[PDB]
Design a protein around this ligand. Sequence first.
Ligand SMILES: C[n+]1cn([C@@H]2O[C@H](COP(=O)(O)OP(=O)(O)OP(=O)(O)O)[C@@H](O)[C@H]2O)c2nc(N)[nH]c(=O)c21
Ligand SMILES: *[C@@H]1O[C@H](CO)[C@@H](O[C@@H]2O[C@H](CO)[C@@H](O)[C@H](O)[C@H]2NC(C)=O)[C@H](O)[C@H]1NC(C)=O
Length: 246
Amino acid sequence: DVSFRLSGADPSSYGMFIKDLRNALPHTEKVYNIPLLLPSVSGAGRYLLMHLFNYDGNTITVAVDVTNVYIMGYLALTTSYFFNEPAADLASQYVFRSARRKITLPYSGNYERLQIAAGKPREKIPIGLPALDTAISTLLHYDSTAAAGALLVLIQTTAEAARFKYIEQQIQERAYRDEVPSSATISLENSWSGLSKQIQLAQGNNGVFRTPTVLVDSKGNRVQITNVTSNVVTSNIQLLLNTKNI
Ligand SMILES: C[n+]1cn([C@@H]2O[C@H](COP(=O)(O)OP(=O)(O)OP(=O)(O)O)[C@@H](O)[C@H]2O)c2nc(N)[nH]c(=O)c21
Ligand SMILES: *[C@@H]1O[C@H](CO)[C@@H](O[C@@H]2O[C@H](CO)[C@@H](O)[C@H](O)[C@H]2NC(C)=O)[C@H](O)[C@H]1NC(C)=O
């Protein structure tokens, strides 16, 4: 498992958590020096448990699919909660067996749907370590509308920071003040699968993407990523979604 405590949290211990989370995702191979997530994993080995504690020290456990870093659901005291999607239903066979009841959220895990349930797109939802404290607090008691927003916080501050060093750094910047995600943050999250695919296809195209990926950069400007020498590939991206799952 991996754990993260908001109590006493600073950029450094959040950095330790994101490293532990990355280290808990298995791989047999690196492609341009980036771990390649597995095509699949059978049984309960497929899910990582992240124990998250808010400032007060109350806790949820979040089940994460180790092949794609998708959050599947979570446990809050004696109740499990899963996304309304077949992968999550499948996960519910293996994790949080002991929960007194299992609630299916009234939405799937994707950003479009979640932004609809929450009432705001991501661009307008502040993230940060305080927002992550809020989200834990929210998930501890069922409220599907609130939960959508809390899940949008939780996905970005865990999975998305695991995937990209830049996003991890953005969150370290808001260790004590939330702020809506930068344009680059949103662009990177939206491009992970596209990027993961092009990096893998470059492997026999001399490092050249077959299709250039458009991103917004750290300065807010619209770049074209055409090859693996780009700093998005050399510095930023930390995990690749296997093309077998694309
Ligand atoms: C298709 N899918 C993607 N995700 C992740 O859940 C979050 C929101 O879902 P998404 O499908 O909106 O992600 P996005 O458009 O960023 O796609 P990506 O570039 O391919 O990742 C993101 O972190 C996704 O990586 C998903 N998470 C869950 N629980 N279930 C899913 O089916 C699912
Ligand atoms: C591949 O990698 C780098 C992207 O980082 C490209 O280098 C850029 O190339 C053009 C001129 O070729 C410049 O306008 C960019 O600003 C360069 N950037 C940097 C950081 O060096 C390179 O051109 C790409 N080439 C191909 C053929 O894919």
